[PDB]
Design a protein around this ligand. Structure first.
Ligand SMILES: [Fe+2]
Length: 289
C-alpha cells in the first residue's frame, strides 16, 4: 500500500504565490526556499520540499505525491490500471524535478493528479525536524500532514483509496452539516479525508490541508501571528473529537483552509485499528469565525 503523503505541488497566480509564502514561513514557521524560477519550496524536514508552489495562470492543486516502497510501486500501479486509470511513467526530468528516484502518474475522475513515487535520499535537518511531525519519526511513519478533499462520489473514491491504494478507514464524523470519512495509511490518524459536496464546496475542491507542529506552543504562537499580522481566523483553537488534534484553521489566499495542529492521535497498529464513529467534529473550541 501507499507509505505516506510525501509531497504536494500547487500552482498559484503570482500574487497568491507570494501571499502563501507568508502563510508557510511567517505563520506556520516552515522553512521556505526560493529557486531560479520563483518557485517556493516549503520544507518541514530534510526533504528538498514537502509542499511546493509553482507559478501558474490558475490556483490549483497540481500533484499529490504518494510515497511508496520500491517493492510496492509496480504492484500498486498495476491495481490503479485495473481500476481503469492510465498510469504513465515519468521521465528523468520529471523524477528529478520531484526530487524522486521514480514517479508514476495518473489522474482521477475528481480532477486530482496522483504521483506514486520512490523517495530519493536526503540529509537529516535536526532543527527543522524538531519542529514538525513529518515523514519518518521515532514513533512511526507520518508523511507531511493530511489533505481533505471534496468529491462527487464519496463511496467510490473511498473504495479507490481503500481497495487500490491500501488506505484503512480511521473513523466517520457525522453531523447535520457534514459526513466526513477519515483514512490512514500509516501512523498519522489520517492522511486523507473525504466528503461529498456541501455548503460551499464542490467536487474536486480542497477543503483543507493540515501540518503538525511538535509543541502546543507552536500552535499558540502561529495562532497569535494570524491575529497580530492582521489576518482572520477561520476556526479558533480547538480539539477534534476523532484525531484529538489541538489546532486552529485559517483561510489561505489560494482558496482553501490551512490547519496547524498538535498532539494528533497515533495509529499504533493498523491491523487492529477500530473504525470509530462520532456525532460531532470537536470536543471544545474550534469556533467558526
Ligand atoms: Fe484536519
Amino acid at each position: 500500500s501507499v507509505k505516506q503523503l510525501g509531497y504536494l505541488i500547487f500552482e498559484c497566480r503570482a500574487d497568491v504565490l507570494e501571499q502563501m509564502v507568508v502563510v508557510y514561513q511567517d505563520i506556520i514557521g516552515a522553512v521556505v526556499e526560493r529557486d531560479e524560477g520563483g518557485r517556493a519550496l516549503v520544507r518541514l524536514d530534510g526533504r528538498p520540499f514537502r509542499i511546493r508552489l509553482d507559478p501558474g495562470p490558475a490556483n490549483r492543486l497540481a500533484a499529490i505525491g504518494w510515497n511508496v516502497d520500491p517493492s510496492d510501486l509496480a504492484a500498486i500501479a498495476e491495481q490503479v490500471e485495473k481500476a481503469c486509470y492510465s498510469v504513465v511513467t515519468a521521465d528523468a526530468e520529471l523524477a528529478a524535478d520531484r526530487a524522486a528516484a521514480q514517479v508514476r502518474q495518473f489522474a482521477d475522475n475528481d480532477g486530482f493528479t496522483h504521483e506514486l513515487y520512490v523517495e530519493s535520499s536526503f540529509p537529516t535537518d535536526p532543527v527543522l525536524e524538531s519542529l514538525f511531525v513529518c515523514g519518518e519519526e521515532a514513533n512511526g511513519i507520518f508523511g507531511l500532514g493530511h489533505l481533505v478533499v471534496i468529491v462527487a462520489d464519496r463511496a467510490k473514491t473511498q473504495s479507490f483509496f481503500t481497495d487500490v491504494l491500501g488506505f484503512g478507514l480511521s473513523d466517520r464524523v457525522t453531523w447535520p452539516e457534514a459526513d466526513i470519512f477519515f483514512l490512514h495509511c500509516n501512523q498519522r490518524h489520517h492522511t486523507v479525508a473525504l466528503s461529498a459536496p456541501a455548503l460551499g464546496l464542490k467536487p474536486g475542491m480542497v477543503h483543507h490541508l493540515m501540518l503538525e507542529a511538535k509543541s502546543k506552543e507552536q500552535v499558540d504562537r502561529a495562532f497569535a501571528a494570524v491575529k497580530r499580522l492582521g489576518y482572520d481566523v477561520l476556526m479558533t483553537i480547538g480539539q477534534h473529537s476523532n484525531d484529538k488534534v489541538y489546532s486552529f484553521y485559517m483561510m489561505a489566499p489560494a482558496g482553501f483552509a490551512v490547519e496547524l495542529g498538535f498532539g494528533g492521535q497515533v495509529i499504533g497498529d493498523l491491523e487492529s485499528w477500530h473504525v470509530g464513529f462520532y456525532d460531532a467534529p470537536s470536543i471544545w473550541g474550534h469556533e467558526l469565525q
